[PDB]
Amino acid sequence: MLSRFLGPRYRELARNWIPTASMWGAVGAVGLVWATDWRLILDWVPYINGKF
Amino acid sequence: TLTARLYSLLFRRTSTFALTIAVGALFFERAFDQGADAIYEHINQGKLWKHIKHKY
Amino acid sequence: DLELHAPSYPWSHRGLLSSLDHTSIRRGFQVYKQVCSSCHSMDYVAYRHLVGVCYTEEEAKALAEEVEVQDGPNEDGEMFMRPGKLSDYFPKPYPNPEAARAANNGALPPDLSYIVRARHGGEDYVFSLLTGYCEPPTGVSLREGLYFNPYFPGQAIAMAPPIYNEVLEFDDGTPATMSQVAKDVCTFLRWASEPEHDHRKRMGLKMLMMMGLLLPLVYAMKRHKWSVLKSRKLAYRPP
Amino acid sequence: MTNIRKSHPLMKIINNAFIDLPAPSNISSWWNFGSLLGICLILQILTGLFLAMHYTSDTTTAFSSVTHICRDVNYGWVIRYLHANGASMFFICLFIHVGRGLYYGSYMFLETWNIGVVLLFTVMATAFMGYVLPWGQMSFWGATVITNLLSAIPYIGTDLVEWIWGGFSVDKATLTRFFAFHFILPFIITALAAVHLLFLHETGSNNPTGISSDMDKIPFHPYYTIKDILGALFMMLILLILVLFSPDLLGDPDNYTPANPLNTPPHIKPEWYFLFAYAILRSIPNKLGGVLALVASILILILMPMLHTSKQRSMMFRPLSQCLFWMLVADLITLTWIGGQPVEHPFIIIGQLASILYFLIILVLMPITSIIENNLLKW
Amino acid sequence: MTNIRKSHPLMKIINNAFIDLPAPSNISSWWNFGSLLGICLILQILTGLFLAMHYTSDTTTAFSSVTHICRDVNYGWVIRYLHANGASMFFICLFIHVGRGLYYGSYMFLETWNIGVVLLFTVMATAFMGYVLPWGQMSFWGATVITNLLSAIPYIGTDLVEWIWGGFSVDKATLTRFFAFHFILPFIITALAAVHLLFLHETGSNNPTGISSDMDKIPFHPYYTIKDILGALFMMLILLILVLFSPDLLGDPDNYTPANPLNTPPHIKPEWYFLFAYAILRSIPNKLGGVLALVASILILILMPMLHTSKQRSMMFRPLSQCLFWMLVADLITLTWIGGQPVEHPFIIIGQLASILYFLIILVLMPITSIIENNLLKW
Amino acid sequence: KGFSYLITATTTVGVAYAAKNAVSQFVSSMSASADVLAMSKIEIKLSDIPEGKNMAFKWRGKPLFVRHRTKKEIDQEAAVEVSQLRDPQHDLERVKKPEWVILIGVCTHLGCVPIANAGDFGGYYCPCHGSHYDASGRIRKGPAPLNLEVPTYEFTSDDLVIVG
Amino acid sequence: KGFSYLITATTTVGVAYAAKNAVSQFVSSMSASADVLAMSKIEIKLSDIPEGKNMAFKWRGKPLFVRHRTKKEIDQEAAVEVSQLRDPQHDLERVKKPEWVILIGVCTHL
Ligand code: HEC
Ligand code: HEM
Ligand code: HEM
Ligand code: HEM
Ligand code: HEM
Numbered sequence A: 001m002l003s004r005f006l007g008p009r010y011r012e013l014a015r016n017w018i019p020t021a022s023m024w025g026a027v028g029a030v031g032l033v034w035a036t037d038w039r040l041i042l043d044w045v046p047y048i049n050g051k052f
Numbered sequence B: 001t002l003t004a005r006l007y008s009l010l011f012r013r014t015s016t017f018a019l020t021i022a023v024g025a026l027f028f029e030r031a032f033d034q035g036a037d038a039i040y041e042h043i044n045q046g047k048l049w050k051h052i053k054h055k056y
Numbered sequence C: 001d002l003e004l005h006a007p008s009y010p011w012s013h014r015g016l017l018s019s020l021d022h023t024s025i026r027r028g029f030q031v032y033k034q035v036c037s038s039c040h041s042m043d044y045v046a047y048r049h050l051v052g053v054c055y056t057e058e059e060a061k062a063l064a065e066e067v068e069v070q071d072g073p074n075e076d077g078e079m080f081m082r083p084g085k086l087s088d089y090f091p092k093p094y095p096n097p098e099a100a101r102a103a104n105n106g107a108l109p110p111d112l113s114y115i116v117r118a119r120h121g122g123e124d125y126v127f128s129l130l131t132g133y134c135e136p137p138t139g140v141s142l143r144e145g146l147y148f149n150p151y152f153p154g155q156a157i158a159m160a161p162p163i164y165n166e167v168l169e170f171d172d173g174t175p176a177t178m179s180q181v182a183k184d185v186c187t188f189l190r191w192a193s194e195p196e197h198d199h200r201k202r203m204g205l206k207m208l209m210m211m212g213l214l215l216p217l218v219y220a221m222k223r224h225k226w227s228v229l230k231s232r233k234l235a236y237r238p239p
Numbered sequence D, E: 001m002t003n004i005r006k007s008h009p010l011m012k013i014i015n016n017a018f019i020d021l022p023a024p025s026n027i028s029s030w031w032n033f034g035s036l037l038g039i040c041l042i043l044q045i046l047t048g049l050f051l052a053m054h055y056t057s058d059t060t061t062a063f064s065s066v067t068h069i070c071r072d073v074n075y076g077w078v079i080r081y082l083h084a085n086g087a088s089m090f091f092i093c094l095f096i097h098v099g100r101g102l103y104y105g106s107y108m109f110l111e112t113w114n115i116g117v118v119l120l121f122t123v124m125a126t127a128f129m130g131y132v133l134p135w136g137q138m139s140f141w142g143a144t145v146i147t148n149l150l151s152a153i154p155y156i157g158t159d160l161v162e163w164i165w166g167g168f169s170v171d172k173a174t175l176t177r178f179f180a181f182h183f184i185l186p187f188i189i190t191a192l193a194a195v196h197l198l199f200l201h202e203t204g205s206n207n208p209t210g211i212s213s214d215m216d217k218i219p220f221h222p223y224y225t226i227k228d229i230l231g232a233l234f235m236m237l238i239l240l241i242l243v244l245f246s247p248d249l250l251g252d253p254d255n256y257t258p259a260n261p262l263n264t265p266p267h268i269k270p271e272w273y274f275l276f277a278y279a280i281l282r283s284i285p286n287k288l289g290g291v292l293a294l295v296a297s298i299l300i301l302i303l304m305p306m307l308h309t310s311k312q313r314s315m316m317f318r319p320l321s322q323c324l325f326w327m328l329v330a331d332l333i334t335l336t337w338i339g340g341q342p343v344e345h346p347f348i349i350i351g352q353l354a355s356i357l358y359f360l361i362i363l364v365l366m367p368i369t370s371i372i373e374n375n376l377l378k379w
Numbered sequence F: 001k002g003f004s005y006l007i008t009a010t011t012t013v014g015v016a017y018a019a020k021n022a023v024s025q026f027v028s029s030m031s032a033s034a035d036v037l038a039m040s041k042i043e044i045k046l047s048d049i050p051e052g053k054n055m056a057f058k059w060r061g062k063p064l065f066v067r068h069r070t071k072k073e074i075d076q077e078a079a080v081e082v083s084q085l086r087d088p089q090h091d092l093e094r095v096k097k098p099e100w101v102i103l104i105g106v107c108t109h110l111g112c113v114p115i116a117n118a119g120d121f122g123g124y125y126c127p128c129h130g131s132h133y134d135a136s137g138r139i140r141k142g143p144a145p146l147n148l149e150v151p152t153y154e155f156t157s158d159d160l161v162i163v164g
Numbered sequence G: 001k002g003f004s005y006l007i008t009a010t011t012t013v014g015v016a017y018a019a020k021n022a023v024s025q026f027v028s029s030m031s032a033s034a035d036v037l038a039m040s041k042i043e044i045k046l047s048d049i050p051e052g053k054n055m056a057f058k059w060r061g062k063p064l065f066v067r068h069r070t071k072k073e074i075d076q077e078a079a080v081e082v083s084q085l086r087d088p089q090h091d092l093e094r095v096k097k098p099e100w101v102i103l104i105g106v107c108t109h110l
């Protein structure tokens, strides 16, 4: 976890996997709000909000 | 074909696959619950407490 | 001996996805309160469960305060009597089982919180029982105090006729015919035994639909991923 | 440098047990029940824990606790009836599993077969204690009868019975110890099921044909895993139908009366899944003979690898023996029905013949027949 | 013909486990605390079961049931005090085991160390719940305080408190569910311990010298089986002095009082094995900071493998680091004593200083000392 | 590929809904029971308690104190100083009827039982650490984080107050 | 060899003593607790009661009717035909003391 991981190839690899990791995090966020039935997000949503 | 565009758009990436599944479940739970409650109240009409609440 | 089984009556809730008529539950609670509660008990059901099923909150509160229920020791050293509220179970009519046995001829009125889930036959039993009273047949002489009911095991139930025509006045104005009273009380007792009867059925409905959807697709998945083995078309080429 | 599936020490066993396990290519659906058992056990563990979440194993409050679960706790009725019907369905799959083992000649696998017999014993004991827990009329009276059956043992009978009771009769102590035993035993079943799988994996599996499939094995992951999931979905279908449309279909209503040790119920029938032995227990007039017959009815599975004599491992190619096996299944159904019925004129003799024929098929008829086709097929 | 010990599946597993496992010869006494842990766990698995069969987990009979076990049960007091003092000795052995791992650099076996941290977490949760079970004044009030600590988490911290509580306060549901979880969890401990051993076997034990001893390994069966027998018996010696002579020596006497949610006890503490973390809890004025410090005090063991900078993995040859380690041990004992005392002058400042010193040693002093250490020895 | 993966996607969304709506069953089961909720509703507080006296209950599961403070005790809390402490919060502000002051019972900042009734600095004296809550509950002698938070209520009438 | 194996034998005999005691504590903890063998145990009745008196008792969990069966009742019970009785138990075989007959107060048949 040191200067080894810092380098142009590692930065480029970061850039390559940023879209995938970021929208994986989006997947996780959507799954979390769905599972928890988080109102503070779901109220702002369309048709879904009619559940409450 | 609509299926071909669908796959090329949001099915190739497994992470986009998961996003599609999750956002689909978001609306599937809503639609299925509304539809099943609708069928249930239609089958049992005038018997559930919701249908007879207004009397009292 | 013999055991005359109860015929299968066509109850409204008998259907696969049919729930009880909650207005019939409202009517069937009144008969329990004014007739059955005089000797029987429903200890496992409180006024709280009544709301949203056959009464609203204010009516439930008024009904609960109609009766008087015992609360714990006051700040003086003794029992203090208070009117009931939402979180009070249905009042016991008799202080203890011994008082119940002594007050009656010597029998015990079973609690109705489960009498429909305990008697073999269910509602069809109880209804028929309440409507099965008749003159004992010739050659049978029941003791004084015993009453003849063919559906009751032994035909020697110690129950005074509970329901007679025009026993109580239904608030909505439905006629007080013994059949109506018995039907409503049996629906109410079934609800008391199985409070989830509505929701369970509702849940079942959904289970019917989605498992009617998951089962093919999952099967469609299996044949999808198992087709490689099902179209192998082997070949043997020895020298 | 190496696949984590086959590099991580913990992942080694999982990969070799469920991912890259060589399984026979022609495995029928009758083997899916092997998964259906295990998955079902987890529900019994999963549900049974939540019942233990709200439960006071006390004579004066156990029934009240169960009613409070089914009436007050959020969706407590779901968990309770899921648990009970899951136990019944568990025994359904256990019987089907034993039938599959008998048919396709799996008892040649010895160690797995004996371990499975031990599993069966433990599961039946667990179900007995579980039915004791609700403390209804049938609960208490069936427990009293079944534990009194142990008095037939010579010399140490009464002391053993009083030991199991924890006192002089089924009471506070009996219920309290039964709850803890019911808690512990399923974990023993889980460890023993792990041992079962460990023993099985060394001999592969028995395909329906019975011939060795070592040369037609297939990877486990893309295959049966999905088929096992489909089987689990069908099992969930049956279980959910049972729970959601008739929770007390497989259960005597008399249990809903609080256990009163003053009134014997009109019938003392145990659960549906025990009568097949209970009927045998009723058949033998002698009490000790009855208990020995009852235990031997289950123990007879151990003798099965010894009694097999047909030179073919499986039952796929033995017609007369197949008729015998289906006669055995019909006998089991008849024994269950007889155990359901009381002890009267038409049922006593039927139970006698059912027990005699059930033992006769396994001990005499099946091996003698197995000789017959061997002589018929020029070997 | 093959030797059954090294050919039978179960016998092969046991043989590789603790029969012919190549272990270092210079393994000191401090490694015995490995086996002893499991032994106590086994005893803890055992006695609790015999407690669980006379415990009615209800707030109106829990204390009465415990008194019943101690008084009107054949040799029940022995079982109950065996349970309590066995918990105390289990935590003694766990702390000594963690100290051994820290000293001789056994955290270099990564997976075993992580699994050990998980075991520590789950066993401490189990012990907390078990101490809640007897339903004394100290039990109830400690449960209230400790669960109420979870309110500090933002947003969703409030909701977890009633979820765990099962209501609006520690009441019926909390006691029953704590009994259920306290029953189930030790089997999870057993599973994780089996995985711990599994991970340890792939590298072998670490000798006190730290350097690999693959040229000196000796078989386990003749030598260490008797050594761990001696260790377990010696541990039983102390345990029996605890139970038989002064049973309530480790425990607040106020626990022998029916729990009453109307009178806080004058003196409030967790058990002796939790006071050390309670010290850091009361050190940080901020509630959320207190909970984070509580988690970190244990979780900091996960950072230890990374912070190791000395070229030696063994602490035998590290004098300065040895003084630092013993200062850390004194720091932990000081934290325990401070947690015992009420929060007043001068205990408050001593607690702050001890917490800061503990974190500072584990995070900063040890690595800097290791670096100057290596500089002092040409590496 | 789209057709096959669409079959897979539909199966996955069905399984997802089932899994959510079963794990939610279990979690809600472990949540608070209906009886607890029906006990945590409005609680019946009656006349009983006479003036100038503090008495306790266990509403919501916590040791609520309702102190009937005399109308003279209302004037005595009027003399209770405000600004210089941590929580001035005049007793009139807390409760509409200072004749009947009510507050949840737990001492914040881990305190031994403050002596009840009129106390000696105005309503209590917390022995473990300072504070010594006022007759309105406020931190009377000390900066102790905050006073015993007052439960909300919709009191029916005098000698009839319901708390919730 | 004899010396070393004597050390072995003494160790294992001490361990056998300790092991039996340790397991016997558990097995006895299985056995009837003190309370259950103080009330459900034998309860010792009385015999000062007059003739033809069913001394009302409550033990074993059930009521106890110990009645002083008078001589007339004794001979009537003995003369009662066992064959017609639903129970195939003769009066003299059912009772050890004809003039003091003890029965559990509960009836069968609920
Ligand atoms: C009014 C609507 C009702 C209903 C639905 C029932 N009862 Fe009664 N009951 C009474 C007594 C003394 C007994 C004991 C008789 C015996 O069990 O031997 C009973 C019994 C019952 C049963 C049990 C029948 C069975 O199958 O076991 C049931 C289902 C039942 N009752 C329902 C006494 C009374 C009254 C005395 C004044 C009144 C009024 C009622 N009962 C009314 C009702
Ligand atoms: C081997 C799997 C299991 C089987 C076959 C089984 C079987 C049963 C049965 C048949 C009942 C009676 C249910 C009723 O009559 O309503 C029962 C009850 C019970 N079981 Fe289980 N059980 C199993 C696993 C477990 C486990 C692991 C636990 C504990 C975690 C548990 C806890 C309970 C409890 C508390 C009851 C009483 C509540 C009730 O009656 O449902 N069970 N069990
Ligand atoms: C606790 C319940 C049980 C579980 C979880 C279990 C688990 C399994 C599993 C998963 C399989 C592989 C799938 C299969 O072949 O069907 C299997 C196979 C087997 N089990 Fe069981 N089993 C149980 C009970 C039994 C019983 C009661 C027996 C009989 C005594 C038994 C004997 C066998 C045999 C012989 C096989 C090999 C079948 C074959 O591959 O042809 N098991 N078991
Ligand atoms: C991981 C090992 C275990 C530890 C460290 C542990 C710890 C404890 C502790 C500290 C107590 C409180 C004792 C007291 O205050 O008197 C306790 C009580 C209890 N434990 Fe455990 N326990 C363990 C395993 C078990 C198991 C496996 C069971 C169930 C079989 C069990 C059942 C009980 C019961 C019923 C009580 C209440 C009886 C009592 O407190 O005296 N324990 N446990
Ligand atoms: C549940 C309680 C535990 C059990 C039953 C257990 C079991 C064992 C056993 C039997 C050994 C081998 C003997 C020994 O080297 O000491 C061992 C080694 C080890 N355990 Fe644990 N352990 C437990 C808790 C922990 C904890 C809390 C940690 C630290 C986080 C840990 C880390 C280790 C390490 C590092 C080793 C290797 C020691 C060496 O190589 O010298 N264990 N464990």
Ligand code: FES
Pocket: F107, F108, F109, F110, F111, F112, F126, F127, F128, F129, F130, F131, F132, F144
């Ligand atoms: S002690 Fe009660 S406020 Fe500090």
